[PDB]
Amino acid sequence: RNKMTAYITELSDMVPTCSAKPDKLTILRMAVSHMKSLTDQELKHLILEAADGFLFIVSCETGRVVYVSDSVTPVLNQPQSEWFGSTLYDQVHPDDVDKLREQLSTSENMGSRRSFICRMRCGPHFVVVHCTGYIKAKFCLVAIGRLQVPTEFISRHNIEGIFTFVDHRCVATVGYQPQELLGKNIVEFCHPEDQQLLRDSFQQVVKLKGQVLSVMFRFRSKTREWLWMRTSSFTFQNPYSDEIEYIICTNTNV
Amino acid sequence: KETEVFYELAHELPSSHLDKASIMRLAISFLRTHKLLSSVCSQMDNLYLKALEGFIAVVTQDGDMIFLSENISKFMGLTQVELTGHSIFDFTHPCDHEEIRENLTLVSTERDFFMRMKCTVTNRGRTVNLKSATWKVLHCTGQVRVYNLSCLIIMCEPIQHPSHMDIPLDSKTFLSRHSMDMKFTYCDDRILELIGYHPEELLGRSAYEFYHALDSENMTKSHQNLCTKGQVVSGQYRMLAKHGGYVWLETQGTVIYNPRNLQPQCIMCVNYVLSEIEKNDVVFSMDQTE
Ligand SMILES: O=S1(=O)N=C(Nc2cccc(F)c2N2CCCC2)c2c(F)cccc21
């Protein structure tokens, strides 16, 4: 009984002209009148609010869009004048048309559904868009496309200390091409005076699993220069087995 | 004499077989949702709903599901009428509740998470009573919005099970099997045409050695989700290509269970190739050095 009374008072609050307390039999009739006094676009608004998506109907034959909603402007910063009168291939990264051809094909898949990711041009700037839709009536695609969320270089090593991954910024920081660091141990590029130090660091990073340790040593550049370098390093662990996949270092000059 | 106005409320409710408490619940939830919609804002609803691969959920800061789109049954079996007005915690996995709470409160308003919701529909398409309800992982993406009270407006998409695929897969997609270690145990031939690796030279290899380091934080996160809830959708990441460069990738991971001993057997991954090989002139790992 308490919950039905609470429902009655809540419905009394939700009706304006009623809050301005008429029974319950009366309260329901006031609510019915308020319902009679009052859709579809309310779904477009919730969808744009939740996923930053816009609806579009294109043609499965030529790709020409038969309808684009105004929601394409807050999503892609493009007016309906651009989309309308064009085809989806013109609004898509040139390396996706093949994919698009496979999705806009109705040779085997009607009323079938479609789900695919593609790069759409916005504002040349492209944004990743997840498109989910279905085939309709020759045939059209009704879909919704939604959006979604040098001083150093990163490197990966094995337990020994051998470069197994090098990010390109090394070319600017130490001068070597990535192929020149890959395959060789990091101790090889270290000043001998400092080598032991570096080794001790690589001996502790593994024994201090997951923790970050910072060593500093002289790195031999391609120009044969002793650049002082601060390497912060930690071991990466497999989330399921806790086994050490590799040692991740952030080699920073100065 | 009795009251038939209760039937008139269900008729003007945008109905017949409902108890009085349910009609109250639906009316009050509709009015609150309309208040929020007047807050956000200043036929084609069929197209907008049929084109969705998920359902819209407007949930208050206290967990009250004040709005659910009509297609929710199509993904969850539980209908719009059965759930509207009820707490989300009464229909989600307890181990996710706290996470749900963290996404319901509060400077940024974007929300992107994975929750486990009750599901009474089977892969056959039949609907099942509420007592036997499996857990379905929903990728929920949306916004927290303060209105005059705070709500969470999210789109909740299920992650298609790799066995039962209703969506046509284009040539830019390929499958890969993994252990819970994420080491490769099987891969499609298409990878050779898409990234350049032979499906055999990848077996027994840890997938953590083949993606660009800058994406690690993403991957591990996904992995944990994939091990905690059974399914996950990764962000956009880079897998290092065979002969230098990398390829952009988004994969849907699903933990497969052995139907006989009910044990986690493997992880199937549906990898969507998002681009051609980028920076193919640059080598990144030792595996790229032939
Ligand atoms: O580039 S990859 O070597 N990294 C892959 N995935 C991966 C790696 C580490 C942790 C993880 F959680 C994952 N997942 C992504 C979501 C499912 C699990 C992957 C893949 F799934 C297929 C092909 C090539 C690759």
Side-chain angles (χ1 to χ4, degrees):
Chain A
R1 291 207 245 263
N2 293 15
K3 196 47 180 169
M4 177 50 86
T5 291
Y7 282 152
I8 284 304
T9 68
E10 270 207 58
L11 193 62
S12 171
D13 299 11
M14 283 293 137
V15 184
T17 36
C18 171
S19 57
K21 277 44 154 186
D23 204 11
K24 172 192 73 62
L25 285 55
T26 313
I27 221 73
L28 302 183
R29 293 198 136 101
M30 316 258 295
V32 172
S33 293
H34 198 48
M35 268 54 149
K36 291 182 291 205
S37 65
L38 297 169
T39 75
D40 51 288
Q41 203 177 350
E42 291 155 357
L43 256 170
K44 131 180 159 59
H45 298 295
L46 283 166
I47 289 162
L48 177 63
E49 168 75 10
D52 238 60
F54 68 98
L55 182 91
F56 62 99
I57 301 173
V58 294
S59 51
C60 300
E61 5 169 302
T62 169
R64 165 147 305 127
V65 40
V66 342
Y67 169 65
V68 53
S69 71
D70 39 357
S71 306
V72 77
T73 301
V75 175
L76 303 183
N77 204 332
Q78 299 247 307
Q80 312 181 68
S81 52
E82 160 65 289
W83 263 64
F84 258 134
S86 60
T87 79
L88 190 57
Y89 299 96
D90 297 312
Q91 322 287 354
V92 152
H93 189 276
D95 284 335
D96 296 329
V97 290
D98 279 336
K99 171 187 309 204
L100 204 52
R101 272 217 308 283
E102 304 194 12
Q103 297 291 342
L104 287 184
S105 175
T106 39
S107 64
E108 298 250 51
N109 279 314
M110 184 79 198
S112 284
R113 296 198 59 82
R114 296 296 197 278
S115 180
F116 62 96
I117 306 175
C118 75
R119 296 162 281 182
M120 280 176 192
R121 192 172 144 268
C122 62
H125 201 51
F126 292 101
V127 280
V128 163
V129 190
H130 292 66
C131 306
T132 52
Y134 69 118
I135 318 294
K136 204 198 173 201
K138 313 188 147 39
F139 288 7
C140 272
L141 172 64
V142 191
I144 294 174
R146 49 150 285 204
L147 276 193
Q148 56 282 299
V149 305
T151 43
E152 56 178 27
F153 78 97
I154 309 283
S155 52
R156 265 145 47 179
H157 303 72
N158 64 1
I159 291 312
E160 286 81 315
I162 275 174
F163 285 96
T164 56
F165 174 89
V166 196
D167 113 76
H168 194 62
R169 289 181 290 176
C170 63
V171 176
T173 63
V174 297
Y176 295 99
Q177 301 299 317
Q179 51 270 44
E180 280 170 301
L181 303 181
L182 284 167
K184 297 136 107 183
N185 195 288
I186 186 181
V187 179
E188 305 182 20
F189 301 89
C190 183
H191 195 291
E193 212 185 278
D194 311 336
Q195 282 190 348
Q196 191 58 58
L197 250 175
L198 183 56
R199 274 159 167 152
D200 291 352
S201 196
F202 267 70
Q203 285 183 262
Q204 265 202 295
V205 135
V206 197
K207 106 179 62 175
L208 302 204
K209 158 160 298 187
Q211 310 191 353
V212 173
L213 315 175
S214 297
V215 78
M216 222 181 301
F217 64 95
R218 272 164 302 182
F219 199 101
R220 188 190 88 252
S221 66
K222 200 183 200 173
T223 66
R224 308 271 166 178
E225 197 180 344
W226 292 122
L227 321 171
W228 273 99
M229 183 93 45
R230 195 274 313 274
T231 290
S232 280
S233 208
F234 63 92
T235 35
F236 189 97
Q237 293 77 26
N238 189 285
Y240 185 85
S241 71
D242 205 27
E243 283 161 0
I244 297 188
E245 294 281 332
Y246 35 62
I247 304 176
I248 295 199
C249 309
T250 303
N251 321 111
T252 318
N253 288 74
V254 162
Chain B
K1 298 181 176 180
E2 64 282 55
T3 76
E4 51 246 20
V5 54
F6 263 112
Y7 160 69
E8 273 308 286
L9 244 196
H11 184 80
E12 293 302 309
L13 222 44
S15 343
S16 280
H17 251 273
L18 263 44
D19 38 302
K20 296 167 184 170
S22 292
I23 298 117
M24 296 302 299
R25 221 175 54 252
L26 249 66
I28 284 155
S29 300
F30 153 53
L31 258 295
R32 278 156 101 193
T33 296
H34 198 256
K35 267 178 133 164
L36 180 101
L37 290 196
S38 293
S39 169
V40 51
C41 307
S42 284
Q43 196 96 14
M44 323 258 271
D45 48 304
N46 317 327
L47 320 170
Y48 273 100
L49 277 196
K50 186 60 173 178
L52 280 183
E53 206 57 55
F55 64 94
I56 301 300
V58 182
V59 187
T60 70
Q61 76 284 327
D62 287 318
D64 292 332
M65 297 175 286
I66 50 172
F67 176 71
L68 299 152
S69 51
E70 208 180 47
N71 55 20
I72 177 176
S73 60
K74 175 165 123 183
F75 307 107
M76 311 310 289
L78 307 169
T79 66
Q80 179 185 30
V81 154
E82 283 174 295
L83 299 142
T84 312
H86 293 125
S87 176
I88 185 175
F89 304 100
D90 287 337
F91 295 93
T92 49
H93 197 292
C95 297
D96 299 333
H97 284 185
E98 211 49 56
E99 185 176 7
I100 293 182
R101 266 154 203 146
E102 299 179 30
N103 284 275
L104 278 176
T105 69
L106 219 70
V107 199
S108 67
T109 66
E110 287 88 20
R111 296 301 187 270
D112 189 311
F113 61 101
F114 300 89
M115 74 182 191
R116 273 167 304 184
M117 207 195 211
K118 283 186 163 114
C119 180
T120 60
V121 69
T122 38
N123 81 279
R124 184 176 174 173
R126 263 173 25 186
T127 324
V128 161
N129 64 95
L130 284 63
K131 300 178 180 179
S132 41
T134 73
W135 289 120
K136 189 180 234 62
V137 171
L138 297 170
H139 183 209
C140 306
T141 58
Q143 302 272 12
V144 178
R145 158 182 291 265
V146 175
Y147 75 111
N148 39 288
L149 298 185
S150 60
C151 274
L152 175 72
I153 302 101
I154 44 173
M155 190 183 60
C156 322
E157 300 171 331
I159 302 153
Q160 209 98 13
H161 196 281
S163 303
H164 324 84
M165 291 231 193
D166 219 315
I167 299 306
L169 285 182
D170 46 294
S171 72
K172 312 297 176 157
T173 312
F174 69 102
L175 303 170
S176 70
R177 207 185 63 201
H178 301 258
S179 59
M180 314 302 295
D181 227 23
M182 278 304 305
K183 290 183 180 141
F184 293 83
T185 67
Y186 162 75
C187 184
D188 264 13
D189 293 350
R190 285 225 49 92
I191 193 169
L192 183 58
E193 305 134 77
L194 292 176
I195 301 157
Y197 299 100
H198 221 77
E200 174 248 351
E201 65 187 309
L202 276 168
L203 312 167
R205 306 296 308 280
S206 175
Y208 281 92
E209 277 183 311
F210 290 84
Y211 69 78
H212 195 285
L214 274 172
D215 302 321
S216 56
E217 175 204 310
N218 174 22
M219 309 314 287
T220 176
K221 253 67 154 183
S222 312
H223 200 183
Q224 288 175 337
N225 276 326
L226 185 45
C227 291
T228 302
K229 307 164 190 179
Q231 285 191 310
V232 76
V233 188
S234 76
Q236 294 100 240
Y237 69 96
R238 288 150 297 205
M239 181 194 181
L240 311 178
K242 173 56 174 294
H243 313 282
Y246 47 70
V247 190
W248 283 102
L249 230 58
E250 168 174 317
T251 89
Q252 303 164 346
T254 295
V255 167
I256 303 304
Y257 288 85
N258 190 336
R260 311 191 212 267
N261 54 31
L262 306 188
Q263 224 76 355
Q265 184 219 331
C266 72
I267 292 172
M268 285 293 303
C269 292
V270 199
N271 328 289
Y272 300 82
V273 172
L274 300 190
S275 69
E276 306 269 6
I277 296 178
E278 296 192 353
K279 299 193 173 306
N280 37 304
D281 58 312
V282 183
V283 298
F284 302 91
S285 73
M286 294 194 62
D287 302 291
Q288 295 192 326
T289 66
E290 299 102 293

